[PDB]
Structure formats: structure tokens, C-alpha cells
Amino acid sequence: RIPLQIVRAETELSAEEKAFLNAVEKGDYATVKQALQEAEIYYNVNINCMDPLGRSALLIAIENENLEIMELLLNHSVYVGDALLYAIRKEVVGAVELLLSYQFSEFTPDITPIMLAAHTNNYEIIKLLVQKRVTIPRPHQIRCNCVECVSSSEVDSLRHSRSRLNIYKALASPSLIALSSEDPILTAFRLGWELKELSKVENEFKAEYEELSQQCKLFAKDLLDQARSSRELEIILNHRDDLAKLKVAIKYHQKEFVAQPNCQQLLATLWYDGFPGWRRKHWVVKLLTCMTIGFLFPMLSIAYLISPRSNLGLFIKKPFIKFICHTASYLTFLFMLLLASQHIVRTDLHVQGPPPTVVEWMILPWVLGFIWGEIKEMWDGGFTEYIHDWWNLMDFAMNSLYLATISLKIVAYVKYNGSRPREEWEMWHPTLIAEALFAISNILSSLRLISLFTANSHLGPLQISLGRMLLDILKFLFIYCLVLLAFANGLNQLYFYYETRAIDEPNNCKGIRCEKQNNAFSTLFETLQSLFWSVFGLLNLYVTNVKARHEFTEFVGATMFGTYNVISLVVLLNMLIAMMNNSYQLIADHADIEWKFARTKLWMSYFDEGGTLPPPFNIIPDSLIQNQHYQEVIRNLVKRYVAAMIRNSKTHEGLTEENFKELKQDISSFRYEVL
């Protein structure tokens, strides 16, 4: 028996106010008029009476979209505050125009009429409001130590965050950008960048800021989509405040703008400069032409040096031929790196400091060219973006290992004279370190070729997904390294008392890299190595067996080894499978825009004159007219976009409501004509 009563009692109005509110809601030109006259004379009705469910007389008159009752209430001095916002949110032009011609609320007090109009994204209401000289407060910069931001955040943090989000939502509407900004493309780019960088700062309101940034990027792409000619697209892309706006969009990570089909057409025509209709030809003749131009890599580079402006000197200046020549030079470098480890060119293996062979003497200009190119990349173009590549770390590692190999070879040549057999050299002979670093640099140089996958149409998205899933490999190795450190600590602590010597063990071998694996858990480094190698099954089971008859210690060690194997394989590897499968499933939707953005970024790196020579040969010693043309193009694009959007806003629901309103008005007019 649960008793049910209204615990929050609302003060109900008198019966005289109910008649006035019912006359307002039903709609009557005479009953409301005489009710207001009686309220003026006898004071029977409070004019500012309000329903318990947040509905004043003016709000109900707005909800009925009738202008006569609204005009009479406006002339009868009804409380008009917080009533234009309801008409704006209802999105009716006549009521907003009438209220602009002159307690409880459903809107937060920081909302202005222009802000709500921008939130609702109605073109006519926003235009009619901005004609009345309205302004929006400027949101502050993200990192503020000023008093006006810090004190406001300290006093009322929720109101501050709500006000900032409301302002940024008002500024990000496509209609307000199309009306109030003279450069909607650059405004959309900048607002998308600020909203994306601000979503990470305000990590709790991340979804709304990410949605607003996506809205701005979509508006920029849709504004570019309305181009009806190649001249308009060339004017858009070349506008400088060669392809300036495309470089700006690449800077602001506008992947949807970059991967637009007409931008990709213009980039493809600029890429195949010397080949009219490269996509037209057969794949066999394309492969033959690519092979010929690649095999002509000593050519077209000497000709550039001896005659830059000849018939043949301008052949390498085209971007595709430049890319082919660079790829051919790198493949030749890797071929000589393969040849450097062969018996035909490498002899006299028992000298402490050897002079370089012919293959290494040929390798040296390539290494100097790579070093000089990476040095020039630090200066030319800039330094703040050189580290913002994530491929230049690999190049820096390659060049550092090359420099270390050269310096160690020089030291071993100048301080070691004579010959000595290789078995009696010391552990840290400079020659051995040089041969190790050269091999590591060979691995890095041959793995550098993955960056060329974005040019191909089939290996590009594959490398994009490879990066996507390496981002989760990086997360998985933290848990794996914690588990590895835990079990290594435990196993070394259990097993370090039974450490033997290399002399006692057979073949003078102490470690897990022997025929009979010895001292697998004796030291912490060897324990880490053993627990790493047990993942691939290369650690045998008898390494947990000690010389003495300590069967309890052996059993506890084998149990630790089995628990580590279970945790590190059965749980963790299949967890990694599930993680990368989920990440691949998410990225497979947006996998072609990313590849097209990466291919575009690779294409614009070959457009400029800098770095024309391959690394073998790169070490051998009025604005008003453009602004007005861009302004006409923006005017046409904005008009086309606003027309397409304004009738794409026509909806079955709104059309149906409009038809009922027109039918009701016409029936009432006909009834008044008959009566």
C-alpha cells in the first residue's frame, strides 16, 4: 500500500486566470480582448499569468503561430522577456520579425538570440538577426592565465564551460560562416582546427567539440563541392592570403577537403605532367615506360647539370619522373648494399683495419647525399615541421649509424696496422662495432621502402591500417613488458642461487644461445632474454632443471614458467588479436580518405624545385585582381550551397505542418467570410 501524493505542490492559479489561458490557447479575437479589458478595469485577471508547465500567454500565442493575438498581447504590455528565443527555436519567420519590430525558462541565461539562431541553423532567421547589428562574444584563447577567465572558472566552472561550448557551437554553424565571414573556406579550416585542438583540452566535453569540428570540415568540403568549372577550382586552390589553399588545408589536416575528386583530378594532372593520359595506357606499356625511365637514372640528372633548360634538362623537373628517378636511385643503393656482403668483392678478412673496398667507395657518395639532403631538410622548408614527420626519425637513425660506421672505420684504419686472425680480436674491436652498425643501418635502409606504399593504389590503405594497428601494438607492449618484468624478477630471484660458470658447462658456453641451454634464469638480463625467447618456443623445458635434487625448487620454477607462458600467450596474444581486429574494423570505413591524403602529401613533396637531383647527384656543386576573382568565386559557391541546403531543408514533417497551417488559415478566412 504505497500512498501517492504530489510532494512538490505547485501554486495553481485562480479560475479567472484559467479562462484567460484557455481563451489564449484556443484562439479567439473577442474573448481574449474582453478578458484583457476586464483585467484592466476590474483587475480580475493577472496579465502575466503563467502555467505550471512553463507556458505563459505569450509563449502559447507563439506556439499557435497566430500574429493577431501576439500583436494584441504586445500592445497590452505582456512580459516579453525570454520570448524571442522561443520563436527563434520554433523557426517561424513572422513571429521573430514581429517580436523584433516591437522566473522559469527553458534556456540558460548565457544564450543570446543570435546564438540560438546560429544553433538552430536557419538561414532566414540568422540573416534577419544579423541585419539588426548583432554581435557574438569572442571566445578566449585555449591557454589563459588572465583574471577574467581564471576567476570565472573558479567561481562557476559549469556556467563557464557551457558558455564557451554555446559560443563555439554558434560560431561553427554553416549559415553564420556563409553570411558573416568573407572567406568561409579559411574560416571553416581555422574553426575546425581550433575545435579539434580544444576537444583534447576539455577532455570531458570531447564529443561535442569533435562533432563541431566534423561539421566545419563537412561545410568546407560541401562548399568546395559546388564548383562547376576547372577555372573556379583553380582559383579556389591557388588563392594566397603554387597551390596555396591546398597547402593550408593540408596544414590544418582537412582530409575530406583534400580527398575531394576534383582536387584529386587537378593533382593528378599536375602529377602526370609529361604523360597525357597515363591512366589510359595498358599496364604492360606503363610498366615498360616506368622501367625505362628508372633505368635511365644516370641520365636526365647529368643532363640537368650540364643544361638545365634544354629539351632533356626539363624532363626530370616533372614530378612523376622525379619520383621514378628517386626510387631508382634508392633501389640502386639497396642493390649495392646487397652486393657489399658478397665474396666476389670482399677478401682478406683477417686484417685489423682494412681500406674500403670498391663497393663501399661507391656507397659513400650515396651516404653523403642522404646526409646532405637531411641537413638541407632541416634548414630549407623549416625546422618546426621537420620533427613533425615521424619518418625523419628513421632517417636520422640511418645517418647517425652511417656516420658512426665511417668514423669507426677511420679510427680502426688509423690506429690498427697489421693483420690478426679474427678469433683473437677483442670483444670491443672497432672493426666489429663498425660491421655491426653497418648491418643495422642496412636493415633500417631496406625497411625505409615502406614509405613508398602510399603511391600505389593497393598498398596505401594497407600501410594506413598498419599504422592504425601499430598504435595498438604500442598499447599492448606496456602490459606485456609489465608481465615480463614481474615474471623475470620472480624467476631470477628463485633461480640465481644455482648459477654455474662457463668452464664447468660443456663447450665453454653459458647462456641460452648454446646447443645445451644453460643458466637461463641466473641473471636478470638472461632471464629477460629467456622469457622473451619462450614466446616463440625457442626455450627448451630442461632449463628449469638444476644440478642438485631440489625437486620443490624445480617444480616452483616450472610452475612460474608455465604461468608466464599461459599469461603471455593464451591471454595476451589473443587479446592483441581481438584489439587489432576491432581497430581494423573501425578503420576500414575511413581507409580511402586517409590514403588519398597521404598520397597528396607525397605528391606535393615532389612539386617544388628543391631536391630535384637524386641523392647520388645532389652533392655535386597584383593581389587585388586575385582577391576580387576569389571573391566572385566565393559569392557563386555560397549562393549555390545555400540554395542546395535551403531546399534540402524541406522535410515531410515541416511541409505537412505548413500545409495544415495554410489549410486552417484558409478555412478560418472562409468561415469569417461566410459569417
Ligand X SMILES: CCCCCCCCCCCCCCCCCCCC(=O)O[C@H](COC(=O)CCCCCCCCCCCCCC)COP(=O)(O)OCCN
Ligand Y SMILES: CC(C)CCC[C@@H](C)[C@H]1CC[C@H]2[C@@H]3CC=C4C[C@@H](OC(=O)CCC(=O)O)CC[C@]4(C)[C@H]3CC[C@]12C
Ligand Z SMILES: CCCCCCCC/C=C\CCCCCCCC(=O)O[C@@H](COC(=O)CCCCCCCCCCCCCCC)COP(=O)([O-])OCC[N+](C)(C)C
List interacting residues with ligand Z (CB under 6 A). 396-397, 400-401, 404, 408, 428, 433, 437, 440
Partner interacting with residue 393 (select from ligand Y, ligand X, ligand YZY, none; CB below 5-8 Å by kind): ligand X
452 binds, among ligand Y, Ca ion, ligand X, none (CB under 5 to 8 A by kind): ligand Y
377 is in an annotated binding site: yes
CA 117 – CA 129 distance, rounded (Å): 8
Residues of this chain that interact with Ca ion (CB under 5 A) are: 392, 395
The DSSP symbol for 570 reads I
In the complex, minimum distance from the CB of residue 483 to ligand YZY, in angstroms, rounded to a whole number: 5
Q: Which of 182, 197, 389, 658 binds a copy of itself (CB under 8 A)?
A: 182
Angstrom distance (rounded) from CA 171 to CA 119: 9
Under the rule (CB under 5 A), what is the footprint of Zn ion? 140, 144, 146, 149
Would you count residue 269 as binding ligand Y (CB under 6 A)? Answer: no
**What mask, x for binding ligand Y by CB under 6 A, covers residues 307 to 346?**
--------------------x---x---------------
Angle between helices 230-237 and 244-251 (to 10 degrees): 60
d(CA 280, CA 285): 11
Beta pairing partners, 50 = 56
Q: Which partner from the list ligand YZY, ligand Z, Zn ion, none does 428 bind, CB cut-off 5 to 8 Å by kind? A: ligand Z
From candidates 14, 46, 48, 131, binder to a copy of itself by CB under 8 A: 131
Q: Do the Cβ atoms of 466 and 594 come closer than 8 Å? A: no
Query: Closest separation between CB of residue 667 and a copy of itself, Å?
Result: 16
Residue with nearest beta carbon to ligand YZY: 562
SS3 419: strand
How many residues bind a copy of itself (CB under 8 A)? The answer is 27
Q: Which does residue 397 touch among ligand YZY, Zn ion, ligand Z, none (CB within 5 to 8 A, set by kind)?
A: ligand Z
Residues in Cβ contact with 17 at an 8 Å cutoff, skipping those fewer than 6 apart = 45, 46, 49
The alpha carbon torsion through 475, 477, 478, 482 (nearest 10 deg) reads 160
- Cα 63 to Cα 48: distance, rounded to the nearest angstrom: 17
Contacts with ligand Y, 429-468, as mask; x by CB under 6 A: --------------------x--xx-xx--x---------
Contact between residue 442 and residue 401 where contact means Cβ atoms under 8 Å apart: no
Q: How far is the CB of 285 from ligand Z (least distance, A)?
A: 41
From CA 603, how far away is CA 390, in angstroms rounded? 18
Cell 686484417 belongs to 351
Q: Which is nearer to Zn ion, 143 or 652 (CB)?
A: 143
Q: Given the rule CB under 6 A, which residues bind ligand X?
A: 390-391, 393-394, 397, 440, 443-444, 447, 450, 463, 466-467, 470
Residue 404 binding partner per list Zn ion, ligand X, ligand Z, none, with a CB distance cut-off of 5 to 8 Å that depends on partner kind: ligand Z
Taking the least distance from each CB to Ca ion, the nearer of 375 and 586 is 375
Nearer to ligand YZY, 443 or 575 (CB): 575
Place of cell 585582381: 625
Counting every residue written for the chain, the total comes to: 675
- Least separation in angstroms between residue 189's CB and Zn ion is 23
Q: Residue 60 and residue 51: Cα distance in Å, rounded? A: 10
**Amino acid identity, position 228:** R
Residue 302 site contact among ligand X, ligand Y, ligand Z, none (CB < 5 to 8 Å, cut-off depends on kind): none
Name which of 364 and 571 has its Cβ closer to ligand Z: 364
How far apart are CB 557 and ligand YZY at their closest, in Å? 9
Which position has the grid cell 561553427?
Answer: 172
Distance between CA 156 and CA 159 in Å, rounded?
6
Within 8 A by CB and 6+ apart from 479, the residues are 572
